[PDB]
Write a protein that binds this ligand. Structure first.
Ligand SMILES: [Zn+2]
Ligand SMILES: [Zn+2]
Ligand SMILES: [Zn+2]
Ligand SMILES: [Zn+2]
Ligand SMILES: [Zn+2]
Ligand SMILES: [Zn+2]
Lengths: 73, 73
């Protein structure tokens, strides 16, 4: 749609997605809804336990733009 | 062909198409190539300046499927 940066904050034991294909570095991660509203088919992704943090979807300095979801472009 | 969701991101002054017949709501839009590879003949469409955003072609939650292009079905 006509045009963000994902807020979402995780608590200590909240899950998220790591995507080794899209991440800017290994400490990056995106929340589950952003993972599911993007395209990671051939990608080397994994569910992780975050230990806390915030979703990088929409932040070109933390995540490759081709890995952004529908709502953060 | 045997079987997507359009990536395309617009910058601030990039043009796209609005189609009032196909849009899920007034903030939806599709890129020019997807507009031209679909069927909008009787439709109430307009060229717009996007202010940024991403193409909704292929996203049934942002665009009516009969307005999808050749490559996003
Ligand atoms: Zn997110
Ligand atoms: Zn997102
Ligand atoms: Zn990915
Ligand atoms: Zn498109
Ligand atoms: Zn399309
Ligand atoms: Zn249309």
């Amino acid at each position: 749609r006509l045009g963000g940066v994902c807020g979402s904050v995780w608590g200590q034991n909240d899950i998220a997605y790591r995507c080794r294909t899209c991440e800017n570095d290994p400490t990056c991660a995106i929340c589950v809804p952003c993972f599911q509203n993007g395209d990671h088919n051939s990608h080397d992704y994994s569910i992780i336990y975050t230990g806390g943090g915030c979703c990088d979807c929409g932040d070109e300095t933390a995540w490759k733009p081709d890995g952004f979801c529908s709502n953060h472009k």
